[PDB]
Amino acid sequence: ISHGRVYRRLGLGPESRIHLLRNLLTGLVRHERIEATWARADEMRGYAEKLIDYGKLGDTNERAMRMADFWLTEKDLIPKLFKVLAPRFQGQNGNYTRMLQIPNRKEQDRAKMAVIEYKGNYLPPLPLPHRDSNLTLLNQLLLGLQQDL
Amino acid sequence: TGRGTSSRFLTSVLHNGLGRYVQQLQRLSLSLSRDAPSSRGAREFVEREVTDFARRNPGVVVYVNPRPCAMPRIVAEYLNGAVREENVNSKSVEEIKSLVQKLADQSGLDVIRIRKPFHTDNPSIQGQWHPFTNKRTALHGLRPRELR
Amino acid sequence: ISRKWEKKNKIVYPPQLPGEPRRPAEIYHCRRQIKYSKDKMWYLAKMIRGMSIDQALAQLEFNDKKGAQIIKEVLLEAQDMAVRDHNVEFRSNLHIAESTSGRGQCLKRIRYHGRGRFGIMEKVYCHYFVKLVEGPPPPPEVPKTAVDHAKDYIQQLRSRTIIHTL
Amino acid sequence: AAPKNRRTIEVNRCRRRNPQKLIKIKNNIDICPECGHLKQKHVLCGYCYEKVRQETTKIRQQIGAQEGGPFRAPSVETMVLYTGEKPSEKDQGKRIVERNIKRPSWFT
Amino acid sequence: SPTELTEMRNDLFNREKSRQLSLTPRTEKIEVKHVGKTDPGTVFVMNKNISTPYSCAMHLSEWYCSKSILALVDGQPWDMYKPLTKSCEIKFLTFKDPDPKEVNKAYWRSCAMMLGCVIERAFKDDYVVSLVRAPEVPVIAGAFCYDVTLDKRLDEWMPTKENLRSFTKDAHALIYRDLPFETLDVDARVALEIFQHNKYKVDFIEEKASQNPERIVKLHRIGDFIDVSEGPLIPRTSVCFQYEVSAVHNLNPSQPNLIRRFQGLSLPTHLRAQFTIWDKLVERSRKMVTED
Amino acid sequence: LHSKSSTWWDEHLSEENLSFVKQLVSDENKTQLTSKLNPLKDEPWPLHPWEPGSFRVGLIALKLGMMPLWTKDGQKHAVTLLQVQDCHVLKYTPKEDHNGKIAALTVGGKTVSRFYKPDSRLEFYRDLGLPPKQIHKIFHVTDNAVIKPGTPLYAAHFRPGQYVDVTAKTIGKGFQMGNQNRTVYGLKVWRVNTKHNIIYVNGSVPGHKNCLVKIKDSTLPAYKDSCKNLPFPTYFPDGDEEELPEDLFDESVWQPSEPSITFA
Amino acid sequence: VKCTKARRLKKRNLRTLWINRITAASQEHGLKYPAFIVNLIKCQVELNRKVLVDLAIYEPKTFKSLAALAKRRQQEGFAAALGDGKEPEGIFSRV
RNA sequence: CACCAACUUCCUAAACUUAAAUUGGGUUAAUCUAUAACUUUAUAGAUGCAACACUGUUAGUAUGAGUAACAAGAAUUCCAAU
Ligand SMILES: [Zn+2]
């Protein structure tokens, strides 16, 4: 019975979910790339995107400062969000976080693994999929159709 | 047991009796011991009745090999390839004589249940019944309900 | 204990005569002592029967069961000896002819309970048998069409012999 | 309640050999062009990811030594530089991580 | 009768094969090093003039055999089934290569050759059909074209929609039959004799012999059918998954004989197409294709 | 491996071609719909007069939602919104070949994507010249009221003041249920929007929002013959004998912008 | 034991099969089974039921002639009953 | 105006007349010894000499059943790290 549900049940309670999400968000900000279970990663992706908006809002915002302090346990990160993450994403209007599927852990539980990272980071690029080139026979056939049209 | 046992139909080796009767038994082998209570009846049989059987049936090869043997044995081979062995351990002269006579009369044909005691290559002479038999015809071969 | 599967690998055929086709290679491999249930392992064996060497290996790589990893290891060892000792030219030219698992000697222990009860503890072991035939897996069977079924039914009717009649 | 009679192997065999209970084959297997190893269509390569993950630890290890303490996350952007690469003017005012290895071909 | 031509044509193909086989005595080991991007540096000792690239794919894995359509021997395109000749560097070409233009042409040529086979056997033995040539058109054109000349008796006969469907059925049967593409390089003199009856084929053979210093010409045989090829062809007919005879266009200046250019489209099993996409491609493939 | 592989429409489509494919699908759908806009100009089947006992075809609509409605008497009545989308006749079944009692007509609406549909469904729709529809339903229609396949159907077929019957699948409640077809009878029609083809139906309709429903004339004994004063085969915008108002209202319905109702 | 029991019933079953086939054959010629047997007995014919089936299967022409004899005796039998015994025995009824 | 149906009865070959404690008589599996035999036999003399059944005793292996059942706070630069 999970019809119309918009929230995952994680941790030992709603407070634990926030704390677990809080810990995940703090770790992601520090490292900018974290590997976690797909279900948890999907839940926290929305939170990370909204956090960047709070950084964009401005340092002087009292709500952002309170929000940043609560979500980020490590206080050294608070300057980073306003001075590193927020400046980086000023051009971007969204999609700050990139989440991709990772092979399942071979730890006898076979948990679904995914990696969530902040776009524009200095970390090495992830092995992203590359779409087929237009030089392919099917694409070339479509190219001929395009020229005729 | 019949469900668990094989069966055959009536048959002849090569239509043996059509032209002339041929004896299926072709070779007899006998093993005997000089000193053995089991062979006592066989011992006397060789003395008295072996010669008579050979004269009566000179077409069967008989091998008699007295040798140190625990149990005397008789082996009979038939033309069709059937080979049968009979133990002569402690059997009397009369029993031996009857057994050999039975072996000569018997054929190599397998001894199992016969489904039919009758074999014929031309069961029908006037023709086998078929549905059209005894059905009256109509003028012009008109099929039923044909207005024509 | 019996180890006849290994002896099957020690069979030496007579020299092939000039008028004889090249004999296909047959390789028997087994692991006698595995800490795994034969019944659970059989499920893996049944599916892989008749598949190619590459296809079976590919499926095993993405399998979640522990037994599947063991099967792939067993398959790799069999393949290595096949080329090394059975003069196999092409590694890819192999298929799974047979795959089955057998029971192995176990260990017996008593299972304690917190409320004074006890149980029978067993450490299960099993054997795994596979025979590999050089060449691609045989083509799959084609189900009979309606026309084929009807022809056989007519043929069966003709083959009928009259029962208990002169 | 206990079983009224022993279950026959034939009955048991049919239950376990029913198609529903048998292991199904998978058709989503794919090849990794980068490493040439197998992968699923919805799953990423692992042989190359092994390089990426280990390289991240090596980069992170260099970062950890440079910081030298906890709660030392900089308030300024960070960049990674490999041997043979010299900082540019745009790199000014950014944390610089120096890697003894040369720039990896995959890393740009 | 056309069957008579195939019988003698097949024999000369068989005799040529035997002569080439006899030409090479014993098995000579040639060191071929793998220059392909994947698994580079592997060296196989293979039999000269016998071993084919497909054998090497078998050595490595089944994936190589399925995904390898062509081979680059010392930087030269070689057929997957063409026996190797000497120690060289070998690389495998697949349908998904970054630049499949070379691969596309081989598929383009093979499809044209297959279409030619259908035309000759599509008609009854009573009718006389002579193939002129296979025009080379870019993949961008949207259809592969084969030119054929009919007899005067067929001047007024045009295929209907059902007739076009029948041709695809014959082509589909060939794909289902999965006949490997035989490859022979033969001198012009022998090739001219094999195709002496078809004057149009005679000139095409001469052109190929003229280009190269020798008279050797590339001959490909699909079962009984034989034809010349501009370049490497597909190893087998089973590669194609979708096949269609889009349309036939009759050349206007066709007084001595009625020259028809047939339009068709084909897709390999590796590259399947959606039903809607295929329908549009077939519609776009029914237009006359000129050579530019 | 020479084995079957899983494929999707986007597997082999490049980004540049993928954008072109999306535009092409929209163009193809638009062209097909425009070609079928004029049924009367497409060799329409003979038109027959109405007689007692005739049954008209029904429509398929999407459940937009509900809103409150006020009448000139001051009473407030909640009403449900139904949208008819791309309603077209697909297949006509002869009376003998379907049921001796009456003939049947197949109508489909709510065009759907062609990417994830079987080839057989696409092949049938290609012959009909229309894009595939989400749901196929069968309507019992008398011979006199039969309409040629490919005829566009509009919400104007029904008129304000007419009672109608709606049947739809009930919402599934999971293991405990639901997901079964049910019908509600005796629902009056208050207003119809021609521009958006929206019909306002009294009462509630089974099923979730955005769910397709089947609309057909009321079968109650009282409303035995209501089609005599309505478009007998259907409403044809192609004829355009008199352009209908964008919004159709029932007499009792209090239209917006009217003076405040005083119970004098 | 089942095989031993089957020995007795097997013979009875075979006799039933022979009678059934005769009845089907006799009815085709229009003669009931009891009439055919009685007429044959009156004709001093001692064929067994098994042979009677055999003649019909492989000698239909002979069986028809046999049917005529039974029918002819039946006709004479009917005549004798109608005659009440005053009339002399029929030509085919002479014993 | 009958047929069918029981080994009742007849017929070919044979047979010579209907339950179970108990009672009379004739054989026999296996092992050892005496004396022989010599691919496993004979005549005597002996005996821990024959098990589809005691909720029997011991061992093995099933069935229930792959069922009941059981298990580690997070991230990372790493398990005597933060
Ligand atoms: Zn890789």
From Swiss-Prot, chain D:
Zn(2+) binds at residues 32, 35, 45, 48. Keywords: Metal-binding, Mitochondrion, Ribonucleoprotein, Ribosomal protein, Transit peptide, Zinc. GO terms for cellular component: cytosol; mitochondrial inner membrane; mitochondrial large ribosomal subunit; mitochondrion. It is found in: Mitochondrion. GO terms for biological process: mitochondrial translation; translation. Transmembrane segments: none annotated. GO terms for molecular function: metal ion binding; structural constituent of ribosome. The keyword Oxidoreductase does not apply. The keyword Kinase does not apply. MRPL32 precursor is processed by the m-AAA protease (composed of AFG3L2 and SPG7), which cleaves the N-terminal transit peptide. Cleavage by the m-AAA protease takes place prior to assembly into the large subunit, an essential step for mitochondrial ribosome (mitoribosome) assembly. Proper processing by the m-AAA protease is dependent on the zinc-binding region within the tightly folded C-terminal domain of MRPL32: zinc-dependent folding halts degradation initiated from the N-terminus and triggers the release of mature MRPL32. Its main location: mitochondrion. Component of the mitochondrial ribosome large subunit (39S) which comprises a 16S rRNA and about 50 distinct proteins. Belongs to the bacterial ribosomal protein bL32 family. Component of the mitochondrial large ribosomal subunit (mt-LSU). The mitochondrial ribosome (mitoribosome) is a large ribonucleoprotein complex responsible for the synthesis of proteins inside mitochondria.
From Swiss-Prot, chain E:
The modification N6-acetyllysine is found at residue 91. Disulfide bonds: none annotated. GO terms for biological process: mitochondrial genome maintenance; mitochondrial translation; translation. Keywords: Acetylation, Mitochondrion, Ribonucleoprotein, Ribosomal protein. The keyword Acetylation applies. It is found in: Mitochondrion. GO terms for cellular component: mitochondrial inner membrane; mitochondrial large ribosomal subunit; mitochondrion. InterPro entries: Beta-grasp_dom_sf, Pro-tRNA_synthetase, TGS, TGS-like, Thr/Ala-tRNA-synth_IIc_edit. Residues 28-94 form the TGS domain. Component of the mitochondrial ribosome large subunit (39S) which comprises a 16S rRNA and about 50 distinct proteins. Belongs to the mitochondrion-specific ribosomal protein mL39 family. This is Large ribosomal subunit protein mL39. The gene is Mrpl39.
UniProtKB/Swiss-Prot annotation, chain F:
Pfam families: Ribosomal_L3 (PF00297). One of its GO terms (molecular function) is structural constituent of ribosome. Gene3D superfamilies: Translation factors. Keywords: Mitochondrion, Ribonucleoprotein, Ribosomal protein, Transit peptide. Component of the mitochondrial ribosome large subunit (39S) which comprises a 16S rRNA and about 50 distinct proteins. Belongs to the universal ribosomal protein uL3 family. The keyword Mitochondrion applies. Its main location: mitochondrion. One of its GO terms (cellular component) is mitochondrion. It is found in: Mitochondrion. One of its GO terms (biological process) is mitochondrial translation. This is Large ribosomal subunit protein uL3m. It comes from Mus musculus.
Swiss-Prot record, chain G:
Keywords: Mitochondrion, Ribonucleoprotein, Ribosomal protein, Transit peptide. The keyword Ribosomal protein applies. GO terms for molecular function: rRNA binding; structural constituent of ribosome. GO terms for biological process: mitochondrial translation; translation. It comes from the Eukaryota. Its main location: mitochondrion. It is found in: Mitochondrion. GO terms for cellular component: mitochondrial inner membrane; mitochondrial large ribosomal subunit; mitochondrial ribosome; mitochondrion. Component of the mitochondrial ribosome large subunit (39S) which comprises a 16S rRNA and about 50 distinct proteins. Interacts with OXA1L. Belongs to the bacterial ribosomal protein bL20 family. This is Large ribosomal subunit protein bL20m.
